[PDB]
Amino acid sequence: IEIGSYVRYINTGTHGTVKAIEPKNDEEWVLLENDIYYRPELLELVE
Amino acid sequence: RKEQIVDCRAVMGLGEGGGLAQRGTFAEGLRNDVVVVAMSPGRRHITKPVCEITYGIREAGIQTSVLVLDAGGGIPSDAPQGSLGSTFGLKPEEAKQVNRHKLCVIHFGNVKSHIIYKARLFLKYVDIPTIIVCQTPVDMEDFAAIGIKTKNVMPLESKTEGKIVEIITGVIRGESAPQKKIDEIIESIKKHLG
Amino acid sequence: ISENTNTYVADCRLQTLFIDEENPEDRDRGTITVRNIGNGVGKVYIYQESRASSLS
Amino acid sequence: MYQIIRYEGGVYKNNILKEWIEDVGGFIIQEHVMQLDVYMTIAIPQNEIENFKEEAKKYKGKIVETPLAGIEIAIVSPSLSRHHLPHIACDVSEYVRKFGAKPNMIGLAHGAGKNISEIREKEKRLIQEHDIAIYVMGNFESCILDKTHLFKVDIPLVVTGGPETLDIPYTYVGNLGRRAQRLRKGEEIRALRQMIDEVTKKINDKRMELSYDPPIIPPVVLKDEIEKRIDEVRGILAPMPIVTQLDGLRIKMDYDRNHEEIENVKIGKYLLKDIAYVTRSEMKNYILIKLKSTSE
Amino acid sequence: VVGITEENETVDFWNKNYKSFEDKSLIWKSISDVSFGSIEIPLPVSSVKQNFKKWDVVLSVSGLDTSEGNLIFVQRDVLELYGLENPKIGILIGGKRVLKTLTADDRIISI
Amino acid sequence: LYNPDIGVPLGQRKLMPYKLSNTDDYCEGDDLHFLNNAAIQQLWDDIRRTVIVGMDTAHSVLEKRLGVEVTPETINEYMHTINHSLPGGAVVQEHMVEVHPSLAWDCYARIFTGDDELADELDSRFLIDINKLFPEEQAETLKAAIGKKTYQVSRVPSLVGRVCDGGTISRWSAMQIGMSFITAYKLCAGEAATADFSYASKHADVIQMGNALPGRRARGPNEPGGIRFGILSDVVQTTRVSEDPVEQSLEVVATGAALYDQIWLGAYMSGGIGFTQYATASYTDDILDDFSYYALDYVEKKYGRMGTKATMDVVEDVAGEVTLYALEQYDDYPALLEDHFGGSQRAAVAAAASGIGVCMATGNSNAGVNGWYLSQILHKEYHSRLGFYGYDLQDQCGASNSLAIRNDEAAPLELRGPNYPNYAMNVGHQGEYAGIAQAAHSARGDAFALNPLVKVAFADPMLVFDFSKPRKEIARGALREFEAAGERDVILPAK
Amino acid sequence: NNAAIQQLWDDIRRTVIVGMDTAHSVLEKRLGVEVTPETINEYMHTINHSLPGGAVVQEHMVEVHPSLAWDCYARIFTGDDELADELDSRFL
Amino acid sequence: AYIDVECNDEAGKAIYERIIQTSLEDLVLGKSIIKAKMICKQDVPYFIIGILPKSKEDFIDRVLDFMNRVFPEGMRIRKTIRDKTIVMVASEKPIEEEWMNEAVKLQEELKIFK
């Protein structure tokens, strides 16, 4: 997982490109192209 | 096993053969742990899916209050192109009565677009973790798509101060909730409360 | 005597004239009060029964 | 003097009616607006009852005679579980509410079982703080008979149960057992009416006891004076911020924080601490006010 | 001060037979509480017996004979002890100390 | 101070329970939906699955063509046979399969006759006794109308009408009748006389609840659109258990609303939510009962139950008086107005009361509908509103069509129905029309309205739905304590 | 006696296919309302709630019990590939 | 379903018959169960409820939910036997062997019910 990758949300399958990683409250968060934070454990890499 | 005393509402029910609760009323369970929020006192919400959750929590040993919203039916006025049919809202006194509880359990319906905006308006004034009990399978991300704080899927620009802490699907309005759903709700409350 | 009850008699000659004064003590027997708020602001009451104080 | 009734009408021009009630010296004990109709529990002097009936019929309102709209009732259920709470117990509480009373569900910690049922001292005192207690028991004669130790309180008592007739040394109303449906059959309605009649008779008897040696000030006017003086009572989030009992009041504010303010309230020419017993309540650390009689 | 609460049938007796109970002495003050009289009470005496309460005015016929009907002023909570259809007539609250101190020699004279 | 996020509370009245007229039961509005109420479904099922066959031509064929002698013993044997064959048992043709008896427990073949001597030596198990079920005068009237004729009532299983449509019932009954005839009298399985039996039982002696609607309407027989108002009046059995004419007319109104306005119009010719609050307005609270009792009191005070002959003046007087009273009641009591919030509900209730009053004054059903239409156009001027637009189509042409004699517009109100050209589309009219047709005869104390055979057939105590007190049965169904047939749980897996 | 045959007839009886291209064209041109795959998804949600017994944002309206119509669905299909893959797969 | 209650208390019999019927209706279990018999022994606190189903684990879970609903609250010690007929004994005391024997007798009686 890194900026510019392609990820999909496992629960719904929304496709987007990772914009930035913005840790908060000692917890990793992933920002996609839809300006929505996600969780790395609920995201996985696709090619 | 400890005594549980409820402050019954001060107003009576809906007629003779009707429901026992009244719209826009609050019944404090003294020690404030959980508040169950019912959209209306009607048969679609009261005693079929709501008092069942109430007695499940009260059986688990956790005191429960039940609040019936004055205007719980419909969609908020802030929904796209406004509301239709009816307007959903939360009163400041209702918000204050909710906010003195450790956790909130709220029962929602079928349509996803209604549930997301209703939850957003509800959490605009509620600052405690809440559990959404709905029928439809709704993902714990569509709330974040419109700005709601969510435990797993946070939004970049949060428009609410309340956190949707759990979503439970498969509870139908006006129908008896099976023991499995009650057990799931109790486990979520216990693990997200203490 | 425009209105009469078992507790007071009221006068309605000036029922739309405002006053902004509060004197909330007991409305005892034969007390003269002026209602200062509401639909009947300005009515003059004379009480025939000992009643409690009122903010209005 | 002040007979308490319930007015059911619309919200349109209700403010004028409230002004009339204030003018004649009545008090609005309860107010609730549902959508367009408002229910008001009002205490007005007896000499203005016909005047108020005439006024109500002008607004197309309805007067309902509430024989219990001055008391708070402790409905005692063995538990708050699915067996008793969501049905029967609510029916009893709501039927009590239908006649003006203020109910409180009391779910005993160890009330269930036959030989394992027990009642704590704290629950006993909490029940005793009320005016009358209604017990909602099961539907087996042996189980009820082997459960009399539960109903040990020096408060008027009405016991409800399944069997039509019981042999306990208390008032008993039959055909109201542990059920699972809403009470809507004719027999069940009749049993509810019988329970209401029993509690009404006990309350009227206690009213005569109180009328032998009347309190120095009525509880309703005392509540009105407290509302006028104390400015924290409109910030109470409880269902009934001040409860009107038979011979006192229940103030739902913290005792440790507000007992000194409550006691130092001057009514008439007396200080409240000299005419009433202000004490902490077992009910969520609230303030309980018990009026003294004119004898002392 | 006594006060009639339960209608039943004994209050109808009392209504005019209280003046017949005028100037009557205390009969007993035993565990069956303090009873006065004793004057005729023609109300049908039922062996069926109903529970009574602390300081409750009772017109029970002590001995199931119409002529010996006692003005039994109950002091303690009495369970099934007495007879009569339903002796419960009223409740004593005012002047409870007077009824407690009342002895056999003392009478109620004027009612 | 204006907070746009407070919202607006709505629907307070709809949260309160709905009482049912002349009962003491309170039910939710959701439980009065025809899909959620098993009692309304069973009402329609019982009406749909009923076919009356005159077993007199068949007896004549057996006597004069096949040389077979027909006696009460042979009729008893035939009844025994058909009660086994009609549910789906096998009588001839070795090696058949049979339907499960658990699915056809509601299937009965009953016999009634106006001949007392023949009814005397008949097995009381299969006999619908007119003498026992009807009072003496009503029994005599029904026997005089029916005559010395024998009829068979076939109630095919409800499952048959639920899987299939309503056109199945007559054919089912005809096949089973023919089979039972050829196996009970030991005849050849197929000859000319068999065709005579089949034709008799298929159309010559058959009585259908509803006629077919071919063409534009496109529906088979025994559908609610084919049931005339007099037939539905005769289905309701309050006339033989009560002497209150208003009560009889109002039970017919309740049944007509629940059948036509709910089932036929909100499902057969519409969909989705349907018209529940349009129909329940006529049988939930005593509003219509109070208006009808006022109409009867007024009529008996100035005219009498049949004291006048139908003229225009009496129609104007009674309809105007009742309409003015009903609208004054709506004005005086806001509870009544908020109960009947829609204008259509109010218009239908007031017009039904006016028509019932005119019928109780004159004893004529067409005068009743004339009064109904006068009430509608007077309501319109009183409140400057009638109902949803599209409601007063038939109410505008009504006055002209009520006493018309032209081919497309003339029909006695008993012979009218949902297929009457004006009545074919709009809700809020048909059940009240059936009630007016019944009230035309309740005024005269008649035993029946249009068909004595239907009245006797639905007086059967073995029907699943009790037609003596339709509102009580509707309330029972709303409270989930009505047992309905047509369920198939013996052939289904455990859930 | 066979529920399978009864359901075979039931499934055929309760099926109606309606084309939605004239409706979309009338919405776009005459009514001045834009039609997008998101709006089609919204309409599909609405019809799926409303087809069995539902009443949209109207609690005061009588509705059929949801468990009574668990077999009711509203589905969509199209010969347009791009529109097909832009639509929700829940009801396609 | 078939509902019958064996109790010497008149009011208890009718009330608990209504309770059994309501608990069956709430879980939608009426058509999936052939018989449901309850034996009430209140003098010695224990109750027996037997279930004969028509003809998976979800159905069994619904059946135990039904037992939990019907049984009185105070009877918390419960044990069940499942051999196509589910029978459970509930009491506030530890279960005795005679109660289990009564349970198996009810189970065998329910098996031959037809």
Ligand code: F43
């Ligand atoms: C909400 C609508 C939208 C529309 O196209 N039709 C509605 C709704 C529709 C839907 C309700 C379900 C839903 O999801 O919409 C259905 C069931 C249509 C049908 N299949 O028969 C219905 N109305 Ni309508 N509708 C009714 C009624 C009414 C009354 C309400 C009067 C009022 O002022 O409150 C008025 C008609 C009138 O003005 O006379 C009315 C209007 C309206 N009705 C207008 C009003 C708003 C609009 O301008 O778009 N209904 C009633 O009068 C009671 C019977 C009720 C019908 C369902 C029932 O019988 O249970 C329902 C009948």
Ligand SMILES: C[C@@H](OP(=O)(O)O)[C@H](NC(=O)/C=C/CCCCSSCCS(=O)(=O)O)C(=O)O
């Ligand atoms: C089959 C159909 O014929 P038509 O639509 O071709 O006339 C016919 N329907 C109608 O006539 C009209 C249907 C509308 C339903 C009644 C309206 S009640 S609520 C709407 C009030 S309004 O705003 O439309 O005036 C029927 O028999 O149901």
